[PDB]
Structure formats: C-alpha cells, structure tokens
Design a protein around this nucleic acid. Structure first.
Length: 56
DNA sequence: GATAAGTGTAGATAAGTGTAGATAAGTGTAGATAAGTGTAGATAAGTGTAGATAAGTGTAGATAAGTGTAGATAAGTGTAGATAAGTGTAGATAAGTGTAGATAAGTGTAGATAAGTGTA
C-alpha cells in the first residue's frame, strides 16, 4: 500500500469519483479493503500467499 | 658595553636664469576668377468644369429564428431499517520519581624552571 509507504509508491483503494469526500465509515472500509488485499484474505495467515506472491 | 644610524659641515659640478643674434611665424595689401543675386522666357503642375457608371438607400416578398404550450421520464427529498463508528469502564505492565553508595570531577596547596625587566 501507498498509504503506509512514505514515497507514495504502491497501490491504494479509492473512491471512484475524484470529487467525492469519503465518509467516516467509507475511509475505514477502504482501509479494510487495502488490508484484505495485502493479506489476500480476511485474517492474517503466514501460510497464505501475500499479494506480492500472488502477483508474481 | 660595542657598533653604526643620524646630523652638521666643506668642496666640486652643472641645473637655472638673463642676454644677444638669426630665421620665419603673423598681418596688411593688391589683383584675378567665379560664388551669389536679379531678370526673361518655356513647359507642365494645379484648379474649375462637364459627362458616365455604379456606390448607397428605400421598398416588397419568402424562409426559418424565437417564444409559448403540452406531455414523459427521472432528478430531488422524506421515511424506515441494519451495521459499526464513538464513548465509558475494568485490569496489566512499565513509564516516572525518590533514595542509597562508589568513583572521579573540581579546588586548594607546595616546589622547580624559565618569561620578564633592569642594567652594562
């Protein structure tokens, strides 16, 4: 995720419209979806592929 | 205490100025050509005059800008339910402070050598 990467390089989950401002729950849902992608799943599990292994 | 910077003193040459003569700058004077102006005639700028075409305006008809009017879809708002932001509450570890002993910063104190200044 770019969110945690100070150089901004990575991926992000975003609202579609550039003009919208995200609601209080939407900002958290977007962070959850980012985390889900990183973990490739709901829970953390070292036995599962990371997103890096998936992409490779 | 020992030498040589620093100044007064004495003589020898050539800067510095007045004086006298020889040539050519500087000015007045006389004559010869051509600048400078008035004068007379020939051509074409400059203006008024008369006719010929097409700018410039009013007039009449044909199409489509411009507005009011009627119906169909979906912006815009209120209303009802479902999940998870947001806050209070209870327990577990380790920040944060006071307290006790060991080492070495920090200061006073005593003696030896050499800048520090006067003197010959």
């Amino acid at each position: 995720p770019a969110r945690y990467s100070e150089k901004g390089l990575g991926f992000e989950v975003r609202l579609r419209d550039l003009d919208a401002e995200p609601g209080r729950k939407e900002k958290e849902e977007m962070k959850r979806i980012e985390d889900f992608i990183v973990n490739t799943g709901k829970d953390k599990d070292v036995d599962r592929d990371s997103f890096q292994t998936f992409c490779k």
